[PDB]
């Protein structure tokens with residue numbers, strides 16, 4: 001993908017990884033960059049507009065825990081205004097294993113529902129043009145942080161979901177790939193709760209080992225978007241970009 | 255694990271795989287077998303009670319989508335009667351990718367919440383005795399049936415959660431392992447809904463390939479329980495029992 005003149009919707013663009021990815025995206029001279037996030041951040045919007053005044057940058061309030069019909073209503077209006085959308089990035093996430101239901105609703109159900117909603121406008125069986133989805137999953141979906149077992153399991157679910165979307169691209173017209181950061185210094189990881197307080201020091205201990213910056217992550221995230229490889233499982237860890245090979249433990253044969 | 259004179263709770267014991275696993279378990283001379291299921295099945299219950307009349311079999315209506323406080327209330331009733339519980343088997347699942355929220359609530363959230371509740375009675379940090387959890391996951395949590403992406407993602411989630419519970423055993427005193435059937439002839443897979451109807455004949459297609467009986471599955475399920483291997487990831491496919499090796503793509507270092 002050459003991002004020049006493209007239209008991109010980015011759910012959760014203004015978080016730590018989001019905003020550094022967004023800084024890199026607007027340098028690629030998008031036509032329209034539509035930010036969907038829970039709370040508006042006028043500082044960040046001003047920063048992005050200063051980086052590239054040529055991009056049309058818009059903001060809509062969006063909480064991924066709303067019902068799928070509410071996501072369809074919002075996406076219908078964005079598609080109507082823009083005519084076309086090239087790429088959807090699903091980035092919402094929380095890390096707090098004291099909040100079991102909300103972790104699962106935001107990190108897994110919400111991503112599935114935004115995806116299900118945008119297929120109304122993209123699915124080629126409904127007359128749409130197809131499209132591309134980039135899901136921010138996590139390396140914890142391969143191998144957990146077992147002190148946050150619910151968070152990690154929510155990310156294993158969206159790694160799997162994204163693998164399946166890619167295999168459904170011949171039917172829907174919608175390709176997909178996962179973006180799986182390793183530990184990245186953002187507000188998500190500095191303080192957080194472990195399940196049943198199994199490890200009250202989990203953030204301290206985790207951040208005693210090598211990390212990358214959100215700037216590093218964001219640079220590799222835009223490289224992975226430019227590679228545009230349906231079914232890729234991208235690892236963005238310690239400043240590098242690598243594709244991993246999914247192990248074939250079982251085959252449905254269908 | 256010697257099942258002689260043990261106390262076992264099985265959530266979702268009277269479905270296809272459950273019931274054949276239940277027949278095998280009550281052959282092994284349990285003290286108490288406690289069945290927790292969303293619907294009553296009077297004939298299955300009566301049949302089980304006849305196999306080994308000396309086992310004490312009790313049935314409680316239980317929906318895994320209730321809040322954790324409600325699960326704790328039910329478990330308190332059971333622990334007060336039995337005093338000790340040796341094994342919890344979490345078996346609830348539905349297969350219907352037209353029901354996104356309820357798939358995730360039953361297959362993933364509900365299993366996490368029953369586990370979270372029973373940790374109130376078992377956690378060694380609170381003076382509890384520890385325990386053993388056997389989670390019915392699925393080979394689709396390794397490699398999806400991509401035409402039911404939400405179902406398969408929910409199973410990837412509980413494979414992950416089970417792996418992490420096992421690694422938390424030194425802290426909690428609760429060990430865990432997953433039971434992952436391949437395609438097994440039950441009512442679950444006879445007719446079912448694919449996501450966005452990507453494959454309406456998904457059930458017909460799936461059963462055009464080698465499968466196993468629920469009798470074979472049940473036999474291998476009780477063999478896995480008797481092996482009692484913390485952190486095992488058991489595949490129960492085509493009549494065999496096989497431990498799989500989890501691929502190491504990333505490590506948190508903690």
Ligand SMILES: CCC(=O)[C@@H](C)c1cc[n+]([C@@H]2O[C@H](COP(=O)([O-])OP(=O)(O)OC[C@H]3O[C@@H](n4cnc5c(N)ncnc54)[C@H](O)[C@@H]3O)[C@@H](O)[C@H]2O)cc1C(N)=O
Nearest residue numbers: 012014015016017063064092093138181182183184186188
């Ligand atoms: C241990 C953390 C982890 O999994 C590692 C391996 C890594 C991988 C993936 N992630 C994922 O990366 C994405 C961004 O994380 P971050 O580190 O920038 O966190 P941060 O908290 O800064 O950003 C969260 C973003 O999600 C949005 N969000 C939260 N709840 C929402 C809701 N209800 N509706 C809509 N948007 C909502 C926020 O508004 C914000 O845009 C998340 O999906 C997160 O799970 C983070 C890391 C990391 N920071 O190290």
Ligand SMILES: CCC(=O)[C@@H](C)c1cc[n+]([C@@H]2O[C@H](COP(=O)([O-])OP(=O)(O)OC[C@H]3O[C@@H](n4cnc5c(N)ncnc54)[C@H](O)[C@@H]3O)[C@@H](O)[C@H]2O)cc1C(N)=O
Nearest residue numbers: 266269270271292317318346347392435436437438440442
């Ligand atoms: C494509 C299916 C698949 O994942 C394969 C590879 C295999 C693996 C795991 N499983 C899993 O094995 C377990 C049993 O499946 P089955 O084939 O016996 O299906 P069946 O539908 O006969 O049994 C479902 C059981 O779950 C219980 N249940 C459903 N909703 C509940 C709720 N809200 N609360 C409490 N209990 C509830 C039912 O009452 C019943 O006891 C499920 O976890 C299922 O996901 C089945 C298969 C299979 N039948 O081929």
